[PDB]
Amino acid sequence: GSHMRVQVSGLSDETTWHTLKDHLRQAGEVTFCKVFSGGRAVVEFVTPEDAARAITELQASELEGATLFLR
């Protein structure tokens, strides 16, 4: 499922998983969304297309005042 997986960095201190999930629903359906230390998270989407759309169209987007980096 690596093709469906996106690594997120740059989250604000206050941002939790469901908020990130809602942000990324702009790109597609989210099947895994967990927040980790240092403003980071790992997300998986239903399809590789959704992951591609997130990286393509949501790169450096602001969430709760913080710019996200996607890879």
Numbering used by the authors: 199 to 269
From the article:
However, TbRGG2 does not contain the signature aromatic residues within its predicted RRM RNA binding motifs, raising the possibility that it may not adopt a canonical RRM fold. To address this question we determined crystal structures of the domain, which encompasses residues 203 to 269, from the T. brucei protein. Two apo RRM structures were obtained, one of the RRM(L209M) mutant, which was constructed to aid in crystallographic phasing and one of the WT RRM. Both structures were solved to 1.8 Å to final Rwork/Rfree values of 15.1%/18.7% and 16.5%/19.7%, respectively. The WT RRM structure contains four subunits in the crystallographic asymmetric unit (ASU) and the RRM(L209M) structure contains one. The RRM molecules in the two structures are essentially identical; the Cα atoms of the RRM in both structures can be superimposed with root mean square deviations (rmsds) of 0.4–0.6 Å. The structure shows that the TbRGG2 RRM indeed harbors the characteristic RRM fold composed of a five-stranded anti-parallel β-sheet surrounded by two α-helices (36–37). The TbRGG2 RRM structures revealed no interfaces significant enough to provide stable oligomerization, suggesting the domain itself does not oligomerize. Although the TbRGG2 RRM adopts an RRM fold, as noted it does not contain the conserved aromatic residues located on the RNP motifs, characteristic of canonical RRM proteins. Instead it harbors valine, arginine and glutamine residues in these positions.
Kinetoplastid RNA (kRNA) editing takes place in the mitochondria of kinetoplastid protists and creates translatable mRNAs by uridine insertion/deletion. TbRGG2 is a 330 residue protein and contains two main domains, an N-terminal glycine (Gly)-rich region composed of GWG and RG repeats and a C-terminal RNA recognition motif (RRM). Unlike these editing accessory proteins, the T. bruceiRGG2 (TbRGG2) protein is required for editing all nine pan-edited mRNAs. TbRGG2 binds RNA and modulates RNA structure and these functionalities have been shown to be to be essential for its role in kRNA editing.
